[PDB]
């Protein structure tokens, strides 16, 4: 199948199998032609981590001679690529334009579930040991077989020392490598940064491109470090009686890894000590944020570097996550002499190797706190090029996947890592207010907005952006950021006034399985036969292709999560900082959102749900102190991806064919809404239409699309009056004051100007302003999900779309600017250029001549 | 006076199960049946 | 007069300006005059 | 006059100019102008031109 087949089909009544099969098919279409990774690293990065999702859109009015947009093309992107905070040396208290005063820490714990190991075949040495200990002996003190009796049963005089150590694993050869592949994928994605390029709370700050230079940083209070002890095989043997225990003891020594001396010098080794330890032992920043950050205007002007970029730090997503791995690791190094020199950090002496003052057989096993002490490539203030910091990860992934792992492990790792792949800001939502004719029938009359924050001053700011980034507002917005499945955070970090402090809560956002280092040592000491040829997927051996797969899977996860929130009627205000203080309805909506997510995860991922999505962080909200909720009804569903991406992943259709013209003659399809007062006087008596129920949408999925055509209006830019309010309102019988307006999720004019580029590159020469159209100068767009079909999670009641003055008949169709969307198949220019370079004009020589295989 | 013993217990009545597979926490809701009970899970996740 | 008891009930839900449910009570619809016309025991049960 | 939302690579060429030390400086997309022979066998090609 192709994207043309998927864009021509919609959702069906059994909706979970449909969505899961659609997501699997879309995963099957994530190809980036690994040959490209050998010619264009940067283009491969851009194509892999920042998907485009092209779409077409237009507006339609009824009785206007004005010419509006009809078939414009844009490219929708989701997620935060990096984060912008104040620098560590910032002393003042005044707010900075786009610079947060602290970032969240999405802390991940250790999964109680252990990934199931699959069978392995023994190497000739392992088979020798197996057929050895299985042989029948006759003890008799004449020979050495009797040494298991006269000497401890952990003796190495019948087997070898390695055979005695690996005896339990020789008896049961099993292995599993998804825990390390998940961390490799997460490390690559968080270091480079996926998504749209937005890198701050403000929707106007964007990343110019994927960064090319990083800076390391050390923080004693914030880093989640682990202890390393380096020895030699001969020195490690002499610690114990005469042989080393098959099971590592408690105290470091919590884990043990055996590395041949030929593999220590590989670039993969420092990234191998990592990805199994607890992270992040060090923090990564963009080298100079003054050159990788741009500001995008309302109309599309890309300006000079950030107004106060001299006091800002560009954190990578690497700094926004916290993983729990092994806390104590014994690096053993087997097959080395007593003069061995540690080749990665000066002043670090291996126990049993070279001593400080030219000495031999060093006698102390010093404990090193954090991966930054050893591996001078991860030192405190080190400027690192992107390629030489990612080469180790690439080599590690390729070696493990092509030697020790199978296809199932790689797929499981991709699906698990997709859950922690993207970070989204708070959901901004507007509110149109209510028509004047219902001023006496409302509790939410004035139009308003929430979490709408932009910082560009080059152009005119939209009237809906009214957020002033104060300290309390900063904290409230920070505690609203969510993972693809919707999990927020309660942990945080702050490095301000040269003081660094992290607040980590006992409630984690998820869990990842621990990596068994015994399998690592067995494979790297060639006791297991390598699994070569057990990779039938061509994208599973690269990493960049795999990372593209998990990024696409994560965007699919968040699109399906937003769709489930609409289906389960989960308000967008259930994920703010005040989700627990406002009203218990948040937990009542969670009680269905959890069922939806649990079914999806049990049907697609195949991993335990409690590791990927809990309600723990949702139920531990803090509400801050002095941030008051905007007067907005809870009519907007949870949404982080714009509509085009949602209908790409789910198959929804929102074209212009669902907008009605319908000169009205009869009364079919209309209802009369009456409100009588105390003495019996009729005070409303308006025309209305019945909003569809979820049952009707289940039996007819087009009804939702028409619903989108009936309650959607293009958001104005310079005024707070939406033309839909001039004609229609919402009548809710279950509200004390039944009249209400429309909410919608509003992204930004700048975030949509960022959609005018086929690729997420904006420095100065990109033209984000759409010429010859000029419509975007007054009306922005409406990329929101439609109004929630139910305002009660448990009990179904019918509300109405009511007229404001009876001059406009709801059956006649909208009288305002109605947007319409469509998913389009349109590759980018640079993508086609790369395709030409890697397929049409690929000479190589290893494909011209080494094609017989 | 108003409790009939054959109508079922009228207090917090425990129940137990053994369970082989250690699962995670689930937030469930017990409600009244009123013929207008409409929830997304009961409407769309009724396939299996 | 009913002594024993399938779903003629309806849950009535009302919320205030703070979004808190304030009624959440079961209810039974009063019969229509047409229903009484087609069945006069509906008036007896009313 | 064509509208043609582009999906594939058919009909396109890559134009490369490398400098003295081997750096690529142009690498642009392009289309091949029709030859007079093709116009002789197909006179519509000139009009599209």
Q: Please provide the DSSP assignment of B1-48 as one string.
A: ----GGG---S--------SS-------------S-B--HHHHHS---
Contact by Cβ (8 Å): A430, A464: yes
Handedness of CA A690, A696, A697, A701 (dihedral sign): negative
Q: At what angle do helices A178-192 and A41-49 cross, to 10 degrees?
A: 100
* Chain B residues close to A563, C-beta within 8 Å: none
* Chain A residues close to D14, C-beta within 8 Å: 833, 836-837, 840-841
Q: Which two tokens stand for residue A693?
A: 């129920």
Closest CA relative to residue A558, chosen from A480, A620, A638: A638
* Chain A residues close to C19, C-beta within 8 Å: 582-583, 585, 633-634
* Chain B residues close to C9, C-beta within 8 Å: 32-36
Distance separating alpha carbons of residues A166 and A129, to the nearest angstrom: 9
- Number of Cβ within 10 Å of residue A781's Cβ equals 24
Distance separating alpha carbons of residues A168 and A161, to the nearest angstrom: 13
Three state DSSP letters for A312-360: EEEEEHHHHEEECCECEEEECCECCCCCCCCCCCCCCCCECCCCCCCCC
Distance separating alpha carbons of residues A515 and A396, to the nearest angstrom: 15
Three state DSSP letters for A561-594: HHHHHHHCCCEHHHHCCCCCCCCCHHHHHHHHHH
Cα D28 from chain centroid? 10
Q: Which residues contact A57 (CB under 8 A, 6 or more apart)?
A: A69, A72, A73, A74, A644, A781, A819, A820, A821, A822
Contact by Cβ (8 Å): C43, C36: yes
Distance separating alpha carbons of residues A773 and A781, to the nearest angstrom: 14
CA atoms within 13 A on the CB side of A31: 11
Beta bridge partners, A760, equal none
Distance separating alpha carbons of residues A451 and A428, to the nearest angstrom: 4
State the DSSP code for A743.
-
- Number of Cβ within 10 Å of residue A784's Cβ equals 26
DSSP string, A478-547: HTT-B-TT------EEEEETTEEEEE--S--SEEEPPP-HHHHHHHHTT-BPP--S----TTTTTSHHHH
Q: Which residues contact B20 (CB under 8 A, 6 or more apart)?
A: none
Q: Which two tokens stand for residue A334?
A: 């087997």
- Number of Cβ within 10 Å of residue A364's Cβ equals 10
Subunits next to D (3 or more Cβ pairs <8 Å) are A
How many residues appear in chain B? 48
Of A443, A444, A792, nearest to C13 by CB-CB distance is A792
- Report the b/e string of A336-355 with b at 16+ CB within 10 A: bebebebebeeebbbbbbbb
Q: Which two tokens stand for residue A201?
A: 């709370």
Nearest CA in chain A to C15: A735
Q: At what angle do helices A585-603 and A15-27 cross, to 10 degrees?
A: 60
**Measured between CB atoms, does C7 come within 8 Å of chain A?**
no
A405's enclosing H/E stretch is: none
Closest CA relative to residue A573, chosen from A633, A647, A653: A633
Quick check: helix, strand or coil at residue A779? strand
Nearest CA in chain A to C10: A795
CA atoms within 13 A on the CB side of C39: 8
Beta bridge partners, D39, equal none
β-bridge pairing A106-110 and A321-323:
parallel
Quick check: helix, strand or coil at residue A278? coil
Contact by Cβ (8 Å): A269, A396: no
Q: Are A and D neighbours with ≥3 CB pairs closer than 8 A?
A: yes
Closest CA relative to residue A821, chosen from A737, A714, A746, A735: A714
Q: Which residues contact A251 (CB under 8 A, 6 or more apart)?
A: A328
With CB atoms and an 8 Å threshold, state whether A797 touches C13. yes
Q: Which residues contact A498 (CB under 8 A, 6 or more apart)?
A: A88, A89
Distance separating alpha carbons of residues A731 and A824, to the nearest angstrom: 36
Distances (CA, A) of A566 to A563, A694, A791: 5, 10, 11
Q: At what angle do helices A544-567 and A41-49 cross, to 10 degrees?
A: 20
β-bridge pairing A255-257 and A328-331:
parallel
Distances (CA, A) of B45 to A15, A62, A438, A563, A691: 8, 39, 38, 14, 22
State the DSSP code for A654.
-
Q: After which residues is chain C broken (C to N over 2.5 A)?
A: 5
DSSP string, A354-393: --TTS-SS-----EEESTTTSSGGG-SS-EEEHHHHHHHH
Q: Which residues contact A215 (CB under 8 A, 6 or more apart)?
A: A284, A285, A286, A287, A381, A382, A383, A384
**Measured between CB atoms, does A830 come within 8 Å of chain D?**
no
In chain C the first and final C-alpha atoms are separated, in Å, by: 10
Distance separating alpha carbons of residues A69 and A76, to the nearest angstrom: 18
**Measured between CB atoms, does B16 come within 8 Å of chain C?**
no
Closest CA relative to residue A485, chosen from A398, A420, A403, A546: A420
Closest CA relative to residue A198, chosen from A638, A755, A782: A755
Distances (CA, A) of A670 to A732, A741, A787: 16, 19, 20
Three state DSSP letters for A152-186: CCCCCCCCCHHHHHCHHHHHCCEECCHHHHHHHHH
* Tally of helices (H runs) and strands (E runs) in chain A: 24, 29
Q: Which two tokens stand for residue C3?
A: 């002594």
Handedness of CA A805, A807, A812, A814 (dihedral sign): negative
* Chain A residues close to D29, C-beta within 8 Å: 829, 832-833, 836
Distance separating alpha carbons of residues A189 and A284, to the nearest angstrom: 13
Q: Which residues contact D23 (CB under 8 A, 6 or more apart)?
A: none
The position carrying tokens 């939209």 is A462
Nearest CA in chain A to B43: A695
Burial zone of A474 (CB within 10 Å; 0-12 exposed, 13-18 middle, 19+ buried): buried
With CB atoms and an 8 Å threshold, state whether A444 touches C18. no
CA atoms within 13 A on the CB side of A4: 6
Contact by Cβ (8 Å): A785, A745: yes
Quick check: helix, strand or coil at residue A477? helix
- Number of Cβ within 10 Å of residue A407's Cβ equals 15
State the DSSP code for A714.
P
Distance separating alpha carbons of residues D36 and D38, to the nearest angstrom: 5
* Chain A residues close to C21, C-beta within 8 Å: 583, 585
Handedness of CA A640, A644, A645, A646 (dihedral sign): positive
- Number of Cβ within 10 Å of residue A536's Cβ equals 8
With CB atoms and an 8 Å threshold, state whether A794 touches B26. no
Of A584, A633, A734, nearest to C14 by CB-CB distance is A734
Q: Minimal Cα–Cα distance from C17 to chain B, Å?
A: 23
Distance separating alpha carbons of residues A67 and D34, to the nearest angstrom: 37
Subunits next to C (3 or more Cβ pairs <8 Å) are A, B
Distance separating alpha carbons of residues A660 and A710, to the nearest angstrom: 9
Count of pairs with CB atoms under 8 A, one residue in A, one in D: 31
With CB atoms and an 8 Å threshold, state whether C26 touches B34. yes
Beta bridge partners, A315, equal A83, A285
Contact by Cβ (8 Å): A535, A563: no
Our CA angle for A225, A229, A232, nearest 5°, is 150
Q: Which two tokens stand for residue A557?
A: 């996860």
Q: Which two tokens stand for residue A784?
A: 């929101």
Q: Which two tokens stand for residue A240?
A: 């114990």
Q: Are A and B neighbours with ≥3 CB pairs closer than 8 A?
A: yes
Closest CA relative to residue A292, chosen from A220, A404, A207: A207
* Chain C residues close to A797, C-beta within 8 Å: 13
Contact by Cβ (8 Å): A842, D15: no
Contact by Cβ (8 Å): A335, A260: yes
CA atoms within 13 A on the CB side of A426: 28
Distances (CA, A) of A312 to A350, A503, B15: 40, 21, 57
Q: Which of C3, C6, C7, C23 to mutate to probe the B interface, most B CBs <10 Å? A: C7
How many residues appear in chain D? 49
Instruction: Kindly calculate the radius of gyration of chain B based on its CA atoms and give it in whole angstroms.
Output: 16
β-bridge pairing A728-731 and A739-740:
antiparallel
How many residues appear in chain C? 46
β-bridge pairing A103-104 and A321-323:
unpaired
Beta bridge partners, A820, equal A58
Closest CA relative to residue A515, chosen from A318, A317, A331, A273: A273
With CB atoms and an 8 Å threshold, state whether C13 touches A585. no
Closest CA relative to residue A701, chosen from A5, A19, A1: A19
* Chain A residues close to C14, C-beta within 8 Å: 734-736
Q: Minimal Cα–Cα distance from C44 to chain B, Å?
A: 24
- Ramachandran area for residue A335 (φ above 0: left; ψ -120 to 50: alpha; else beta): left
Query: What dihedral angle (degrees, nearest 10) is formed by the CA atoms of A28, A32, A37, A40?
Result: -170
In chain A the first and final C-alpha atoms are separated, in Å, by: 28
Contact by Cβ (8 Å): A750, A454: yes
Distance separating alpha carbons of residues A740 and A225, to the nearest angstrom: 53
Contact by Cβ (8 Å): D34, D49: yes
Q: Which two tokens stand for residue A372?
A: 């930054």
Closest CA relative to residue A72, chosen from A714, A764, A771, A818: A771
With CB atoms and an 8 Å threshold, state whether A839 touches D8. no
Q: Where are the beta strands (DSSP E) in A748-823?
A: 800-803, 818-823
Q: Which two tokens stand for residue A468?
A: 């002033």
Of A73, A827, A837, nearest to D14 by CB-CB distance is A837
Contact by Cβ (8 Å): A108, A320: no
Q: For residue A456, say if its preceding peptide bond is cis, omega within 30 degrees of 0.
A: no
Closest CA relative to residue A252, chosen from A330, A369, A348, A352: A330
Q: Which two tokens stand for residue D17?
A: 């100019």
Q: Minimal Cα–Cα distance from A408 to chain C, Å?
A: 47
CA atoms within 13 A on the CB side of A486: 30
With CB atoms and an 8 Å threshold, state whether D29 touches A832. yes
Query: What dihedral angle (degrees, nearest 10) is formed by the CA atoms of B3, B6, B12, B16?
Result: 180
Distance separating alpha carbons of residues A652 and A707, to the nearest angstrom: 12
With CB atoms and an 8 Å threshold, state whether A795 touches C11. yes
* Chain D residues close to A840, C-beta within 8 Å: 9, 14
Q: Which residues contact A438 (CB under 8 A, 6 or more apart)?
A: A729, A739, A804
Nearest CA in chain B to C9: B34
CA atoms within 13 A on the CB side of A535: 20
* Tally of helices (H runs) and strands (E runs) in chain D: 2, 2
The position carrying tokens 């001023």 is A439
Quick check: helix, strand or coil at residue A443? coil
Distance separating alpha carbons of residues C20 and A582, to the nearest angstrom: 8
Query: What dihedral angle (degrees, nearest 10) is formed by the CA atoms of A372, A374, A375, A380?
Result: 30
Distance separating alpha carbons of residues A19 and B44, to the nearest angstrom: 12
Q: Minimal Cα–Cα distance from D37 to chain A, Å?
A: 25
Closest CA relative to residue A624, chosen from A791, A426, A422: A426
* Chain C residues close to B37, C-beta within 8 Å: 11
Handedness of CA A554, A560, A566, A567 (dihedral sign): negative
**Measured between CB atoms, does B18 come within 8 Å of chain C?**
no
* Chain B residues close to A574, C-beta within 8 Å: none
* Chain C residues close to B6, C-beta within 8 Å: none
Distance separating alpha carbons of residues A429 and A790, to the nearest angstrom: 18
Beta bridge partners, A383, equal A215
């Amino acid at each position: 199948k192709t994207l043309y087949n998927y864009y021509s089909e919609g959702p069906s009544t059994p909706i979970m199998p449909h969505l899961v099969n659609r997501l699997r098919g879309l995963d099957a279409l994530a190809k980036i032609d690994a040959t490209l990774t050998k010619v264009d690293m940067n283009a491969a990065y851009i194509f892999a981590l920042r998907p485009t999702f092209p779409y077409s859109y237009g507006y339609k009015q009824r009785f206007s001679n004005r010419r509006l947009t009809t078939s414009a093309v844009c490219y929708a992107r989701t997620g935060l690529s990096s984060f912008l905070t104040v620098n560590k040396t910032y002393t003042s208290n005044s707010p900075l334009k786009g610079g947060s005063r602290g970032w969240p820490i999405f802390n991940v714990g250790v999964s109680p579930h252990v990934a199931e190991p699959h069978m392995r075949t023994l190497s000739p040495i392992g088979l020798e040991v197996f057929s050895q200990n299985l042989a029948t002996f006759s003890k008799t003190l004449l020979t050495a077989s009797s040494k298991v009796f006269t000497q401890s049963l952990y003796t190495a005089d019948i087997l070898s020392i390695f055979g005695e150590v690996f005896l339990p694993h020789v008896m049961q050869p099993v292995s599993n490598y998804t825990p390390i592949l998940v961390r490799a994928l997460l490390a690559l994605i968080h270091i480079l940064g996926p998504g749209s390029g937005n890198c701050s709370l403000s929707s106007s700050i964007f990343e110019s491109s994927i960064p090319q230079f990083f800076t390391v940083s050390h923080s004693t209070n914030m880093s989640n470090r682990t202890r390393y002890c380096l020895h030699t095989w001969s020195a490690y043997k002499d610690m114990f009686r005469n042989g080393i225990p098959p099971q590592s003891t408690l105290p470091g020594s919590s884990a043990r890894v055996l590395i041949p001396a030929a593999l220590v010098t590989s670039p993969m080794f420092p990234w191998l000590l990592a990805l199994v330890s607890s992270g992040p032992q060090f923090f990564l920043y963009s080298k100079d944020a003054s050159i990788n950050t741009v500001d995008i205007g309302s109309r599309g002007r890309i300006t000079s570097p950030i107004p106060d970029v001299a006091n800002l730090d560009l954190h990578r997503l690497w700094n926004l996550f916290r993983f729990d791995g092994h806390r104590y690791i014994d690096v053993v190094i087997v097959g080395v002499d007593r003069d061995y020199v540690w080749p990665y950090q000066n002043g670090v002496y291996v126990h049993g190797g070279k001593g400080p003052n030219g000495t031999d057989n060093y006698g102390n096993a010093d404990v090193h706190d954090g991966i930054g002490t050893i591996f001078s490539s991860f030192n405190d203030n080190v400027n690192v090029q992107t390629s030489d910091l990612i080469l180790g990860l690439l080599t590690l992934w390729n070696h493990i996947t092509t030697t020790y792992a199978t296809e199932e492990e790689v797929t499981m790792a991709i699906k698990i890592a997709a859950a922690f792949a993207l970070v989204y800001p708070v959901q901004p939502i507007v509110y149109s207010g209510c028509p004047r004719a219902f001023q006496s029938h409302t509790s939410y009359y004035q139009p308003s907005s929430e979490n709408c924050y932009t910082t560009d001053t080059a152009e005119v700011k939209s009237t809906w952006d009214t957020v002033e980034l104060s300290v309390q507002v900063n904290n409230a917005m920070v505690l609203g950021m969510t993972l693809p499945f919707g999990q927020p955070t309660v942990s945080s970090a702050q490095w301000f006034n040269n003081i660094d402090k992290a607040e980590i809560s006992m409630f984690k956002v998820g869990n990842l399985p621990l990596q068994n280092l015994d399998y690592l040592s067995l494979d790297m000491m060639e006791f297991y036969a390598p699994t070569t040829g057990q990779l039938y997927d061509i994208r599973s051996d690269n990493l960049i292709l795999s990372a593209h797969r998990t990024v696409n899977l994560g965007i699919g996860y968040t699109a399906l999560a937003d769709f489930f929130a609409y289906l389960a009627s989960v308000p967008a205000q259930s994920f703010y900082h005040d989700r627990m203080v406002t009203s218990p309805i948040s937990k009542q909506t969670y009680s269905v959102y959890e069922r939806f997510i649990e079914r999806f995860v049990d049907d697609f991922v195949g991993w335990d749900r409690c590791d990927l999505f809990n309600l723990d962080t949702l139920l531990a909200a803090k509400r801050i102190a002095g941030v008051a909720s905007s007067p907005i009804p809870w009519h907007c569903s949870l949404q982080r991806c714009p509509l085009p991406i949602i209908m790409h992943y789910t198959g929804l259709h929102f074209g212009q064919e669902h907008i009605t013209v319908r000169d009205v003659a009869g009364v079919e399809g209309l209802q009369q809404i009456v409100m009588r007062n105390d003495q019996g006087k009729i005070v409303v008596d308006a025309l209305g239409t019945a909003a569809p129920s979820r049952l009707a949408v289940k039996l007819d999925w087009s009804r939702l699309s028409a619903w989108y055509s009936d309650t959607t209006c293009a958001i104005p830019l310079s005024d707070r009056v939406m033309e839909i309010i001039n004609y229609a309102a919402i009548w809710d019988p279950t509200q004390e004051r039944r009249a209400t307006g429309f909410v919608y999720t509003y992204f930004s004019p700048n975030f949509l100007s960022s959609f005018n580029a086929s690729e997420p590159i904006f420095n100065t020469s990109i033209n984000l302003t759409p010429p010859y159209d000029d419509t975007s100068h007054t009306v922005i767009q409406n990329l929101s999900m439609p109004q929630m079909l139910s305002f009660d999670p448990y009990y179904e009641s019918t509300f109405y779309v009511v007229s404001a003055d009876n001059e406009w008949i709801p059956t006649s169709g909208p009288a305002w600017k109605v947007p319409y969307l469509e998913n389009v198949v349109k590759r980018s220019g640079r993508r086609l250029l790369a395709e030409l370079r890697i397929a049409s004009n690929n000479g190589s020589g290893d494909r011209t001549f080494l094609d017989d295989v």
